[PDB]
Design an enzyme around this catalytic site. Sequence first.
Site, PDB file in Angstrom:
ATOM      1  N   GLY A   1       0.788  -0.877  -0.434  1.00 42.72           N
ATOM      2  CA  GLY A   1       0.023   0.099   0.056  1.00 42.72           C
ATOM      3  C   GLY A   1       0.327   0.709  -0.051  1.00 42.72           C
ATOM      4  N   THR A   2       0.072   2.328   0.400  1.00 41.98           N
ATOM      5  CA  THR A   2       0.942   3.415   0.324  1.00 41.98           C
ATOM      6  C   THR A   2       2.402   3.181   1.483  1.00 41.98           C
ATOM      7  OG1 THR A   2      -0.839   4.084   2.604  1.00 41.98           O
ATOM      8  CG2 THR A   2      -1.072   4.889   0.227  1.00 41.98           C
TER       9      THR A   2
ATOM     10  N   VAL B   1       5.944  -2.108  -0.571  1.00 38.61           N
ATOM     11  CA  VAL B   1       6.717  -4.119  -0.069  1.00 38.61           C
ATOM     12  C   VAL B   1       6.317  -3.748   1.243  1.00 38.61           C
ATOM     13  CG1 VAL B   1       6.157  -5.932  -2.024  1.00 38.61           C
ATOM     14  CG2 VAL B   1       6.934  -3.477  -2.372  1.00 38.61           C
TER      15      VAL B   1
ATOM     16  N   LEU C   1       3.752  -9.524  14.033  1.00 36.58           N
ATOM     17  CA  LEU C   1       2.108  -9.756  14.257  1.00 36.58           C
ATOM     18  C   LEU C   1       1.614 -10.376  13.082  1.00 36.58           C
ATOM     19  CD1 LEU C   1       3.825  -7.233  15.575  1.00 36.58           C
ATOM     20  CD2 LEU C   1       1.674  -7.708  16.749  1.00 36.58           C
TER      21      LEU C   1
ATOM     22  N   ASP D   1      -1.810   8.590  11.013  1.00 38.94           N
ATOM     23  CA  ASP D   1      -2.717   7.441  10.549  1.00 38.94           C
ATOM     24  C   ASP D   1      -3.243   6.430  11.543  1.00 38.94           C
ATOM     25  OD1 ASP D   1      -4.349   7.488   8.388  1.00 38.94           O
ATOM     26  OD2 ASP D   1      -2.565   6.136   7.072  1.00 38.94           O
TER      27      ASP D   1
ATOM     28  N   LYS E   1      -5.812   4.081  12.479  1.00 43.35           N
ATOM     29  CA  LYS E   1      -6.542   3.440  12.099  1.00 43.35           C
ATOM     30  C   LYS E   1      -6.970   1.943  11.952  1.00 43.35           C
ATOM     31  CE  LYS E   1      -4.596   3.877   7.518  1.00 43.35           C
ATOM     32  NZ  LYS E   1      -5.184   4.032   5.975  1.00 43.35           N
TER      33      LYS E   1
ATOM     34  N   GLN F   1      -6.428  -1.207  10.497  1.00 43.68           N
ATOM     35  CA  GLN F   1      -5.574  -1.600   9.514  1.00 43.68           C
ATOM     36  C   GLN F   1      -3.963  -0.913  10.262  1.00 43.68           C
ATOM     37  OE1 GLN F   1      -8.438   0.817   8.666  1.00 43.68           O
ATOM     38  NE2 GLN F   1      -8.592   0.390   6.469  1.00 43.68           N
ATOM     39  N   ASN F   2      -4.171  -0.221  10.908  1.00 41.41           N
ATOM     40  CA  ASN F   2      -2.439  -0.193  11.614  1.00 41.41           C
ATOM     41  C   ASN F   2      -1.935  -0.147  12.666  1.00 41.41           C
ATOM     42  OD1 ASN F   2      -2.115   1.232   8.891  1.00 41.41           O
ATOM     43  ND2 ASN F   2      -2.112   3.456   9.390  1.00 41.41           N
TER      44      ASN F   2
ATOM     45  N   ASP G   1       3.027   1.686  11.430  1.00 40.40           N
ATOM     46  CA  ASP G   1       2.797   2.705  10.083  1.00 40.40           C
ATOM     47  C   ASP G   1       3.012   3.846  10.871  1.00 40.40           C
ATOM     48  OD1 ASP G   1       2.595   3.957   8.061  1.00 40.40           O
ATOM     49  OD2 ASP G   1       0.485   2.198   7.266  1.00 40.40           O
TER      50      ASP G   1
HETATM   51  C1  WZZ Z   1      -0.251  -1.750   8.354  1.00 39.08           C
HETATM   52  C2  WZZ Z   1       0.952  -2.362   8.067  1.00 39.08           C
HETATM   53  C3  WZZ Z   1       0.905  -3.414   6.817  1.00 39.08           C
HETATM   54  N1  WZZ Z   1       2.182  -1.398   7.225  1.00 39.08           N
HETATM   55  C4  WZZ Z   1       2.470  -0.765   8.381  1.00 39.08           C
HETATM   56  O1  WZZ Z   1       3.470   0.232   7.884  1.00 39.08           O
HETATM   57  O2  WZZ Z   1       3.295  -2.475   9.355  1.00 39.08           O
HETATM   58  C5  WZZ Z   1       4.651  -1.999   9.573  1.00 39.08           C
HETATM   59  C6  WZZ Z   1       5.664  -2.298   8.991  1.00 39.08           C
HETATM   60  C7  WZZ Z   1       5.650  -3.484   8.651  1.00 39.08           C
HETATM   61  C8  WZZ Z   1       5.846  -3.690  10.491  1.00 39.08           C
HETATM   62  C9  WZZ Z   1       4.827  -5.494  10.833  1.00 39.08           C
HETATM   63  C10 WZZ Z   1       3.740  -5.543   9.552  1.00 39.08           C
HETATM   64  C11 WZZ Z   1       3.467  -6.867  10.631  1.00 39.08           C
HETATM   65  N2  WZZ Z   1       2.555  -8.247   9.792  1.00 39.08           N
HETATM   66  C12 WZZ Z   1       0.969  -7.401   9.499  1.00 39.08           C
HETATM   67  C13 WZZ Z   1      -0.085  -8.459   9.639  1.00 39.08           C
HETATM   68  C14 WZZ Z   1      -1.140  -8.164   9.276  1.00 39.08           C
HETATM   69  C15 WZZ Z   1      -1.449  -7.239   8.823  1.00 39.08           C
HETATM   70  C16 WZZ Z   1      -0.522  -5.840   8.596  1.00 39.08           C
HETATM   71  N3  WZZ Z   1       0.934  -6.206   9.338  1.00 39.08           N
HETATM   72  N4  WZZ Z   1       4.061  -7.242  11.764  1.00 39.08           N
HETATM   73  N5  WZZ Z   1       5.028  -5.812  11.852  1.00 39.08           N
HETATM   74  C17 WZZ Z   1       5.062  -2.810  11.313  1.00 39.08           C
END
Ligand code: WZZ
Lengths: 298, 272
Positions: free
Chosen positions: A14-15, A18, A84, A128, A130, A132-133, A146
């Site tokens: 997303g924003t 990857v 997580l 931000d 929400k 999702q984050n 995020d």
């Molecule tokens: C919202 C996220 C996608 N974007 C973000 O910037 O998160 C950070 C960078 C990645 C790191 C992270 C992702 C992660 N697994 C999961 C499992 C389910 C949903 C979303 N992510 N565990 N840790 C934390």
Amino acid sequence: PMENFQKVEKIGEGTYGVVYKARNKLTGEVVALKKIRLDTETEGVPSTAIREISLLKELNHPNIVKLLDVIHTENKLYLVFEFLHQDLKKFMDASALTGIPLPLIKSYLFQLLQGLAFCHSHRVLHRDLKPQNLLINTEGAIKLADFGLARAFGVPVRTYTHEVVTLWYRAPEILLGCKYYSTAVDIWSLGCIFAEMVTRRALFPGDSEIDQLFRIFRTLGTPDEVVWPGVTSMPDYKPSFPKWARQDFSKVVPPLDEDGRSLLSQMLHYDPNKRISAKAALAHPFFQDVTKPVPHLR
Amino acid sequence: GSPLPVLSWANREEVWKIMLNKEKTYLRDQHFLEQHPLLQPKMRAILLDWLMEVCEVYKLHRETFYLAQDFFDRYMATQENVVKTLLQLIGISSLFIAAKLEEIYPPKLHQFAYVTDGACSGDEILTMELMIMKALKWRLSPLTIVSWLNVYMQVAYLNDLHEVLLPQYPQQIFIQIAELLDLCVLDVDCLEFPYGILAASALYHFSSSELMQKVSGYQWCDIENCVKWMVPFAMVIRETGSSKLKHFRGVADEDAHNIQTHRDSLDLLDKA
Ligand SMILES: CC(C)NC(=O)O[C@@H]1CC[C@H](c2cc(Nc3ccccn3)n[nH]2)C1
């Protein structure tokens, strides 16, 4: 460089860039990877990236998701985060029939405020928040993720980037075109999300900045120079707005004890000045169960 | 000792301490130009003075400026034996990282190459930004010389509800002090004194050890050193008379004091 890490499955693009879930082959260590394609960038390492790195470096806390390393190879940068399993929306969705235990709502909100209280005292706004984050693990933890749209606030804050925060989770001061802004914008997000968690339904699903304000108003009451000094002189305030009565909070989030329904109202005060703080939220009687006070030197 | 009023969002002491604890992790060495034996002080001066000029023309933030300084001086003390030719690239690379960090609409890579008049191209800058950022260990959140002066000026205008968030203070006085720091920084011996104190020190020269103390906490002693060291630099600002706040029609008004500026300062640094 990357030789110990086996991409197991991608979890989101997303924003943020990857993001694939990785394995540490020798260890059985499961991390999150954010891939950043440097070639693709005219403007070198993104603004949003340099920020989220140096902030997370100094934002070590148990309810913030942890940056663990930064790796540069072959015109590709890799951020490597604590991993997580589920995000708070897909959870909230999975439990849309069953309800969410109020024990767990309370617990979760608590841990979020500790993360936010940490950021704010570290002089950092999420901007931000929400579902999702908000990431949850299998031991019942919840954690802020995020920090791309985050930003430190010089204690005498100056003017920051106007349009921030996804519409639904966005606070009435940003919608009504306020100049400066600070910590109270994060709280409104968290308040929207409390109510979400309770009603398994977003509190203010606006399809536009106009719809969002009006949806808010229809629930909290068209605000005046009484409940919110300044409001009337504010830039995107129009004297045209309809008038709606605030409603009983026993209807808007029926399942919630007075201790909750109060807390929430202070989290969604219109006046950012009067809006409750992160730190002060922790004090609220709602957490009577998880609240265990300490002393006070003068 | 914390000169912050009762905060709403957090513990005023908590906040101030974090801010203090930060100014440790963030380290500087007045005598780092000895690890580059072919490098002279008067060099560093001219580079920093160049960066200001460029920050002005592009209506950059003082903060942006100081982030540049800080990235420079921290980075060099991780390096050894560097040539005068390399410094044009290391400074404007530093600045690029800052601009990207602090502005909303930062200048584009070519405009940054541009200024180098060929001697640095966008591709070189993009490589450098990365050796720098891996060498400060991605620690790009230092409290800057100017960062403090903003704190202190805000704490100098309390009114009744001790509101420390909405900036409420006069621009001409800020500008006048900036001018004194924006010099002091050209001489490397300032890294001796923490940015907290440099900022205190300078404010004392435009006020008194009573304001200084209620804004900064620092006691007349804690500074005496840098206020001694700073004396020379003050005379010169006072001798010429202090600056008028200009307006740049690009820039709004409730930000005009935050836009970095320039004046030969060659002639001025020498007079110490
Ligand atoms: C919202 C996220 C996608 N974007 C973000 O910037 O998160 C950070 C960078 C990645 C790191 C992270 C992702 C992660 N697994 C999961 C499992 C389910 C949903 C979303 N992510 N565990 N840790 C934390």
